Amino acid sequence: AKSKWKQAFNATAVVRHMRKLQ
Amino acid sequence: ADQLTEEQIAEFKEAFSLFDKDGDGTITTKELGTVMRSLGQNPTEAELQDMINEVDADGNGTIDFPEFLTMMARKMKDTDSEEEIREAFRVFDKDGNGYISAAELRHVMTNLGEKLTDEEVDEMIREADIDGDGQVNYEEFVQMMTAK
Ligand SMILES: [Ca+2]
Ligand SMILES: [Ca+2]
Ligand SMILES: [Ca+2]
Ligand SMILES: [Ca+2]
Structure with a gap:
């Protein structure tokens, strides 16, 4: 259950972060 | 970084599978982009290319399982x-x-x-x-x- 949270959570977090660095 | 714990590695491991539908052990631009864009976001190809190129240490235009851990590890750090x-x-x-x-x-x-x-x-x-x-x-x- 917690794993799923990390997935969507990290997915959105990394997207905004990685894209921002651009 | 150059030292990832088994904790963060495992987290991305499961997520990796969720991203790698073909479970080929490698993620392509279309895949990473398709899944990412699915997040209700509509980033431009330039945004994805740059995203990959950033983690693409070899600039091969594709990211392997290991490289995936890098992307998640980069954000996981901060x-x-x-x-x-x-x-x-x-x-x-x-x-x-x-x-x-x-x-x-x-x-x-x-x-x-x-x-x-x-x-x-x-x-x-x-x-x-x-x-x-x-x-x-x-x-x-x-x-x-x-x-x-
Ligand atoms: Ca509540
Ligand atoms: Ca794949
Ligand atoms: Ca609501
Ligand atoms: Ca690469």
Whole structure:
């Protein structure tokens, strides 16, 4: 259950972060 | 960095599978982009190319399983539960009502190509919802983010 949270959570977090660095 | 723990590696391991539908052990631009874009976002190809090129240590135009850990590891290092949750909470909360319902959470989850059932969604919210109101709030979101 917690794993799923990390997935969507990290997915959105990394997207905004990685894209921002651009 | 150059030293990733088995904890973060495992987290991306599961997520990696959720991203690698063909389980070929490698992620392509179309894949990483398709899943990412599914997050209710419509980033331009230039945004994706740059995203990959950044982690693409070899600039081969593709990222392998190992490289994937790098992308997640990069953000995991500066994990800002503050902004991270804020932006994430907004993505899941389309109506911006401040509360995440099963319908929404299930929708975004399905976008990633993940097949979750009503029972799984309910457990996710219930397990994340301290009050058990059938929804997840911002405070509950951070509380659920507990690594334990
Ligand atoms: Ca693949
Ligand atoms: Ca590469
Ligand atoms: Ca909502
Ligand atoms: Ca709640």
